[PDB]
Design a protein around this ligand. Structure first.
Ligand SMILES: *C1=CC(=O)N(CC)C1=O
Ligand code: SF4
Lengths: 73, 109
């Protein structure tokens, strides 16, 4: 799992900030995107983000995930 | 700072209304979280989530993932602290406003 990898949401992930679904529940499962970052630490200092995998999808939309919620394409 | 507490209080009430979420039926829980947020804002400069243990609070504030409202709340409406609850949550009440006295009853202890 590295920045740049192409991944697919392979688990149920319901978000409320989707551009075409703002403020309403929307399941991202099945959507494909690219890993933009892996929040394991800040400038070398360990951080505790529980959804470290930041993935960017089209439509200027991005969301955070746990490693197990996405799969390399 | 009392103005910081009032500010955090205002933030919570407005965010709840904006996201259609509600405070815990037991406002003592709500009060504890709000005061905790206020304290972190006073010490760290940001409202770092108060119901978590950190290895480096300063780095956490810089990353911002846990600065209220955190990523899980903003994206999945998941609030570990039980501050912002969805209507279907068994612990959600009907309030989106909390008494200032309730918050101060926590400040003293
Ligand atoms: C304060 C922190 C937290 O997680 N909760 C819920 C039990 C509080 O009241
Ligand atoms: S879980 Fe997130 S949204 Fe809820 S009080 Fe903590 S920091 Fe704020």
């Amino acid at each position: 799992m590295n920045v740049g990898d192409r991944v697919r949401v392979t688990s149920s992930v319901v978000v409320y900030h989707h551009p075409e679904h703002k403020k309403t529940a929307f399941d991202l499962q099945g959507m494909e995107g690219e890993v933009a970052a892996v929040l394991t630490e800040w400038q070398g200092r360990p951080i505790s983000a529980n959804l470290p995998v930041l993935v960017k999808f089209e439509q200027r939309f991005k969301a955070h995930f746990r490693p197990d919620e996405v799969t390399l394409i | 700072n009392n103005k910081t507490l009032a500010a955090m209080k205002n933030f919570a009430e407005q965010y709840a209304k904006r996201t259609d979420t509600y405070f815990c039926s037991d406002l003592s829980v709500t009060a504890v979280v709000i005061e905790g947020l206020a304290r972190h804002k006073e010490e760290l400069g940001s409202p770092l989530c108060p119901c978590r243990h950190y290895e480096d609070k300063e780095a956490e504030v810089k990353n911002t993932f846990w600065n209220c409202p955190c990523v899980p709340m903003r994206e999945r409406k998941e609030c570990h602290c039980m501050l912002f609850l969805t209507p279907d949550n068994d612990f959600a009440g009907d309030a989106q406003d909390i008494p200032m006295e309730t918050l101060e009853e926590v400040k003293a202890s």
